[model samples]
Target: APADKPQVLASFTQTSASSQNAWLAANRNQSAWAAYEFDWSTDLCTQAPDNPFGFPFNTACARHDFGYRNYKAAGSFDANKSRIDSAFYEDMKRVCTGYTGEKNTACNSTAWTYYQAVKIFG
Candidate 1:
């Protein structure tokens, strides 16, 4: 439930150091690591009480988490921090993009908070 470490999504460190074989070996074998069911289907929102504002809520959130973890794993934090911040901010902004007035403002603020919290803590 904490903002910085890891959750369903919204984490970002941001980069790729470029080790092709290493990367390939690492990813090619899913058994080498844990497997978590990322809900790629539409049912994530469909099963929820409401999908809300046409946002791809489940997928976008997963993408945010992916941006964070993969980046941090790739390189130096100092080099990657801003990329991390931008990822979450940009991603959430898109999530909030469909709204207007108060909803938009509130979503933007929430996105900013997520970016800042991770920026400082992780």
Candidate 2:
């Protein structure tokens, strides 16, 4: 597999005009739609085998497993759809990184929103 990189799943126009509007209307929180981004590069660097100050290998393993589970649970993987959904959630999590204990919730909510928007029909 190629080294993971941060990516945006949705275009600004689509995210802002449609997804953001729907997300805000459903959740009553417009701020959640703020532009978001993530760099797996950082996570990868921290999790690298050679990094002395990095997270332990087990931690990386657990994270990967959790991410995989989340992805699978969201839907059957389609290269295009999975890429879009993953990037969306990753960006949401990035925005919530400053939160003390709410980051996971924010990320989860973002993931669910993306899943609903792209995978499920209303």
Candidate 3:
């Protein structure tokens, strides 16, 4: 493992566009990060809806998985779970941005619910 493993994990969990892009890129070839030994395991969204209100939140959930698994692996989940959950909400909201009017409103509502769930029970 490298000294920057935690930093790299933080980058992937951030809400910035570049952060997401980096996640997307790394997601494509996870073998490249095998040295870090991140736990990519995920029951994607678990029992929650991966796509609520016709909005695709699967990727956001996957990112949430990344944060949760990696942080838990590092024994730092308690310290960083909130930020990771916030990032998940932001990622889902970005998904909601593609719609407008009632659809967008519904999407945002669903995102909020998902965020709340992770904050309280995750």
Candidate 4:
């Protein structure tokens, strides 16, 4: 692998929803990053619903967890976790933008709750 493993990881994790979703679409099989030896494993939101109330947050949260799991494995989790969580929140908030009025409010509220959960328990 190159010396840019962290950089590669950040490219996938700390991106806009469109790019992140595109990355997920192309890399869902995980083999694309085999050279980096990242921990692709993810419970995907864990106790939280993968798609809470019909909103699609699964891939968003999975990449977030990907950042956390991989960085923790690299022993640099503490250095990068806050940014990862922020990326997660931003990703989910993008999902919320697909809605409007009450639906948007609900989605944003859920996104906030999920972000808080990781800050405490992630």
Candidates in order, TM-scores: namely 0.46, 0.28, 0.91, 0.83
lDDT of each: 0.47, 0.36, 0.85, 0.78
Q: How would the candidate models be sorted by TM-score, starting from the highest?
A: 3, 4, 1, 2
lDDT by residue (1-122, candidate 3, tens digit) is: 99999899999988787888899899988999999888877766665755544577878889899998888888989989888888889998898899999998999999998898788875
> Count of backbone clashes for each model?
4, 0, 0, 0
| Clash-forming residue pairs, model 3 | none
lDDT by residue for model 4 (60-100), tens: 77888788888888888888888888888998898889999
User: What CA root-mean-square deviation does each model show from the true structure?
Assistant: 10.7, 16.2, 1.7, 2.4
Off by over 4 Å in 3: 49-52
Candidate whose TM-score is highest: 3
| lDDT per residue (tens digit) for residues 38-82 in model 1 | 222223223332333444455434444444455455454455557
lDDT of 3: 0.85
- Model 1: runs farther than 4 Å from truth? 1-61
Sequence-dependent TM-score of model 2: 0.28
At residue 17, candidate 4 shows an lDDT of 70
Question: TM-score: which is higher, 2 or 4?
Answer: 4
Residue 27's lDDT within candidate 4 is: 63
lDDT of 2 at 90: 48
Which of the numbered candidates is closest to the native, going by highest lDDT? 3
Question: Could you give candidate 2's per-residue lDDT for residues 1-122 as a string of tens digits?
Answer: 11231122222212233543443252343245343322112142232234222212332222333333433443633433444444444444444454555554654554455345544521
